């Protein structure tokens, strides 16, 4: 899953998304 939406679809940071970001539930 390349990094389309530039960043995660909730931070809006590169280097990681919404599946590699530091909060991402991860329950
Ligand atoms: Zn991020």
Do not use: Y
């Amino acid at each position: 899953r390349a990094p389309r939406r530039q960043g995660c679809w909730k931070c809006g940071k590169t280097g990681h998304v919404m599946a590699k970001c530091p909060e991402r539930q991860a329950g």
